[PDB]
């Protein structure tokens, strides 16, 4: 029946990578690369004290399932002779002699994984002979649940029952040696596939066709315009309800969110197919939802979407979690069963999560997730600010070191997240009042002595963007922007001098009403539905056929040429918008001293003044007494022309509006954007490649390389409705009228910049990528990802750049 064995320890462990040369230290390599190092590593493992019990166990299961599980009902097993020669020289040989004794009185047949058909009569001891010589075990890496190298030992030639079988495979698809690597994986990384993934009769060319690819290019050039319009309408239809809110009743940012949720669904589903229900129920997982739903009911529905987003992320370790989700979610009929199963596996969930410092931070959240059956994700997030902050700052820092060309943006976001109030965005409040103190108030987040000088965030963004592009006007930025209570409220100082809650003391309500007014004006006036109606796209050719010419591992397109027109009609931009931005500017009547500080109380200006006071005026020379007899009346004229009653808002309006602020109708237009601009994507002999996601996957997409994109706004009109000024009462009116000159120079600068920042015959090149998807979530480009040749590792280091299996050697 049984056999003779001693060592059944079975347990083992994995290994670690090497790193080498100038490659980044993040080791995430894959197959190939280490061609002949694998045999050496396997020999080193074989030279460990743990090798013999693992191989003895392997023999045990081999003779268990292969020999006498298809037997032992009518053949007792005996193992008289059995020996290995696992030597320190890494050479092992085996000799085995087995007896099959049939107690039953019948004649049967012996089943083996070979053409084995032997007849044994009743009460006979059938003989089994196995011999193998000391030889170097061959090493083949199979795949693991996390998709790693399952190195297994193969026999080159062994005599079974006296006949020699070659390249013998031992226990395929199941081996107990458990040695793996955390940095070397299975498959062809991103590039080794592109020698045989495409070609004469390969997957892509067979699964790509001319009509389909041109339909794809049309689809890509349409859906971008579509999603642009959808984003435009959505952000703003939300603002429609945002603005018309009456003060005193707070609104969550997610309150109106459900009010127009169908537009969100359409947006996100036209982005990625079917990915609308996922957000549809994501956006209702708070106590504020009219139809609240459980996060378990949420997660249960569309597993495919969670899988897609998880493998869209760039963190490699997450792949390991992807191993269990199917094992987690097999045979589940409703969310209650999910709660039950998660509670059952919580014993296995706690240690691995609780053993990593990164997740040692996360430790609390998962607990109450597994305890209470009514967790709602937004309430969950507001329950624990700190851990979310600690993780998010690390992710933000990684992003900041990733892309430095937006150094100030990656800057500004960071200083938003220092204060713990920001995450209250996922908490009940008044969104406008909350966002104001998030961006319209000085910050003092430090405790050395006092850091109120850090000021607000938008002003930091300003002085970052306009670092040195201006010199003189920065004084006005200090005067009316950098020291504006509407823009910089100077917290903790408001309740220091008033102590009576005056109407002016509460700057908060004034800035809030101005913000609401601007939002409502941009929303219901500018971003109105009728305005977005007056934009369209028109097809031009859609007639030529693109053929595919190929030579071995190449796929070209003979003549790319697609061009669509976009008609703007009357992209009307009402007045009152920059009126609202002026309302942002301070309304104080004090302008005389500020104009002096700009025009006169400068640094170099006083330099020329002192130069001319002490000397100068060639030819005259000695007429110095009346030098302070001329530089008083001209300034007197520049100061008397301005009206004390008027403000800097009026001064800016004069050069922007023309006609006075008192006679401005918001119904009229300021900016006129009309006409039609074309896009002429084209080319010849462009290669088609497979395009990928971030992590291991079955399904794939594709792309066309290096398209010569040309976009031209020739024959477009971009004008001002009020080109000619109308100001009856300009700020600097009189014989020394400069307001109309400011208007004229503004018009000329606008014309020049529209000749530059607007239509300039833009030329660009990129790689148009499309992941073509069928109707029933069955995109045409995919692989079985079950054979050890269809695995593509997007994050594996380029082996052609240099890696060696040794510590810096």
């Amino acid at each position, epitope marked *: 029946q049984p056999a003779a064995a001693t060592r059944i320890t079975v347990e083992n462990g994995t290994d670690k990578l090497v790193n080498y040369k100038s490659s980044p230290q993040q080791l995430f390599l894959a197959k190939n690369a280490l061609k002949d190092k694998l045999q050496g590593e396997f020999d080193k493992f074989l030279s460990d004290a743990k090798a013999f019990p693992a191989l003895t166990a392997d023999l045990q299961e081999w003779v268990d399932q292969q020999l006498f599980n298809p037997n032992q009902s009518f053949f007792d097993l005996s193992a008289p002779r059995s020996n290995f020669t696992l030597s320190s020289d890494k050479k092992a040989s085996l000799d085995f002699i087995f007896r099959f004794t049939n107690f039953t009185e019948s004649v049967q047949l012996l089943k083996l994984p070979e053409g084995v058909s032997v007849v044994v009569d009743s009460k006979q001891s059938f003989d089994y002979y196995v011999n193998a010589s000391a030889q170097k075990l061959l090493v083949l890496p199979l795949s693991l649940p996390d998709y790693t190298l399952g190195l297994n030992y193969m026999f080159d030639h062994i005599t079974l029952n006296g006949k020699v079988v070659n390249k013998f495979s031992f226990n395929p698809f199941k081996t107990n040696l458990n040695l793996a690597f955390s940095n070397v994986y299975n498959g062809v990384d991103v590039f080794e596939a592109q020698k045989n993934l495409v070609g004469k009769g390969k997957y892509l060319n067979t699964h790509v066709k001319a009509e389909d690819v041109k339909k794809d290019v049309n689809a890509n050039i349409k859906n971008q315009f579509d999603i642009a319009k959808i984003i435009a309408e959505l952000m703003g239809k939300a603002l429609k309800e945002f603005g018309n809110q009456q003060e005193g009743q707070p609104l969550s940012f997610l309150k109106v969110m459900d009010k127009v949720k169908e537009d969100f669904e359409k947006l996100f589903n036209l982005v990625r197919p079917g990915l609308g229900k996922f957000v549809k129920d994501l956006i209702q997982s708070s106590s504020q939802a009219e139809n609240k739903i459980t996060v378990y009911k949420l997660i249960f529905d569309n597993k495919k979407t969670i899988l897609n987003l998880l493998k869209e992320l760039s963190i490699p370790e997450l792949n390991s979690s992807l191993g269990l989700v199917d094992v987690l979610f097999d045979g589940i009929t409703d969310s209650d069963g999910l709660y039950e199963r998660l509670q059952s596996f919580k014993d296995l969930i706690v240690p691995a999560v609780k053993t990593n410092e990164k997740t*040692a931070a996360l430790s609390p959240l998962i607990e109450e997730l597994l*305890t209470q059956k009514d967790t709602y994700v937004f309430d969950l997030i507001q329950k624990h600010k700190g851990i979310l902050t600690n993780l998010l700052k690390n992710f933000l820092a990684d992003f900041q070191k990733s892309t430095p060309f937006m150094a100030d943006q990656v800057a500004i976001f960071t200083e938003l997240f220092d204060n713990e109030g920001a995450f209250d965005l996922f908490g009940e409040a008044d969104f406008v009042d909350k966002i104001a103190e998030l961006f319209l108030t000085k910050r003092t987040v430090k405790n050395g002595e006092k850091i109120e000088t850090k000021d607000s965030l938008l002003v930091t963004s300003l002085k970052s963007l306009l670092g040195e592009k201006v010199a003189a006007l920065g004084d006005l930025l200090d005067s009316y922007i950098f020291k504006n209570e509407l823009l910089n409220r100077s917290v903790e100082v408001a309740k220091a001098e008033a102590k009576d809650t005056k109407g002016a003391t509460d700057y908060k309500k004034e800035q809030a009403k101005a913000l609401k007014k601007l939002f409502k004006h941009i929303g219901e006036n500018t971003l109105s539905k009728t305005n977005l109606d007056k934009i369209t796209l028109k097809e031009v050719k859609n007639t030529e056929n693109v053929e595919l010419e190929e030579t071995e591992t190449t796929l070209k397109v003979k003549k790319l040429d697609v061009e669509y027109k976009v008609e703007l009609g009357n992209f009307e931009i009402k007045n009152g918008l920059i009126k609202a931005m002026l309302e942002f500017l301070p309304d104080t009547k004090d302008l005389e001293t500020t104009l002096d500080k700009l025009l006169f109380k400068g640094e170099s200006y006083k330099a020329m003044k002192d130069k001319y006071i002490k000397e100068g005026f060639p030819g005259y020379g000695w007429a110095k007494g009346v030098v302070p007899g001329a530089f008083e009346s001209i300034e007197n004229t520049f100061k008397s022309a301005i009206d004390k009653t008027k403000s800097i808002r009026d001064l800016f309006g004069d050069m922007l509006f023309g006609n006075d602020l008192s006679s401005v109708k918001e119904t009229d237009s300021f900016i006129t954007l009309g006409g039609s601009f074309d896009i002429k994507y084209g080319g010849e002999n462009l290669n088609v490649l497979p395009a990928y996601y971030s992590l291991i996957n079955s399904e794939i997409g594709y792309q066309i390389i290096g398209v010569d994109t040309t976009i031209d706004a020739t024959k477009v009109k971009v004008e001002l409705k009020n080109k000619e000024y109308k100001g009856k009462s300009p700020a600097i009116n009189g014989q020394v009228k400069l307001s109309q000159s400011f208007f004229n120079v503004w018009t000329n600068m606008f014309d020049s910049i529209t000749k530059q920042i607007f239509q300039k015959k833009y030329e660009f090149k990129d790689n148009i990528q499309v992941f073509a998807r069928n109707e029933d979530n069955t995109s045409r480009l995919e692989l079985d990802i079950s054979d050890p040749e269809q695995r593509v590792i997007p994050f594996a280091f380029v082996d052609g750049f240099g890696i060696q299996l040794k510590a810096v050697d």
Partner: antibody
Amino acid sequence: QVQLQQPGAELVKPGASVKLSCKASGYSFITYWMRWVRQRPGQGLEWIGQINPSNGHTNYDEKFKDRATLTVDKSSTTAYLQLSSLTSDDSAVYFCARSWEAMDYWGQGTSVTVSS
Amino acid sequence: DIVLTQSPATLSVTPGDSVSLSCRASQGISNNLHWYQQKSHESPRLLIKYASQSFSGIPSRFSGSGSGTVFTLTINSVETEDFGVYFCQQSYSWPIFTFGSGTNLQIKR
């Protein structure tokens, strides 16, 4: 809201097995860890083990693994301590507890005397 | 194993005092700590969770702070039935949940 208790002032002879109980109620007995903890009067606290909710897996102290046995009655929501009279000086007090992750409830305790 | 060290061993104060208890570890445990109250001859009362989370029923006068290994419990107002021994208790791993050497709150009046 959790009441997990039953006995008090246990008396056991040397050489005879002893059974301590703690009967819980007022929550889902299927969603937390039961715990046994020991304290000598006037000194620190020592652990015994955990076995619940239905996985029937247990974790003991190595200093107490041969010493004590834990059992759970699922229908009546009760846990048990069975260490017998293996030692004599252990005539001290015990406690049976519930998961701290919700919050660390406790029982009023069980004082045991190993004598006749 | 993780050993929690408390200081001082004894704490004698007057009613209403703002006092603190210091518990330090050998290596960081993130927020895997707890503060329990035990008065003489009965079961403990857990006071503060996670070094940052209070718990219901406990009066608001208690508070906690936590960073790395240096964790602090704060009693804004000392009152008579707060007197007793107190234990800090880690939850990084559960080979047991080491408690401290003990700190017995006491009065001086």
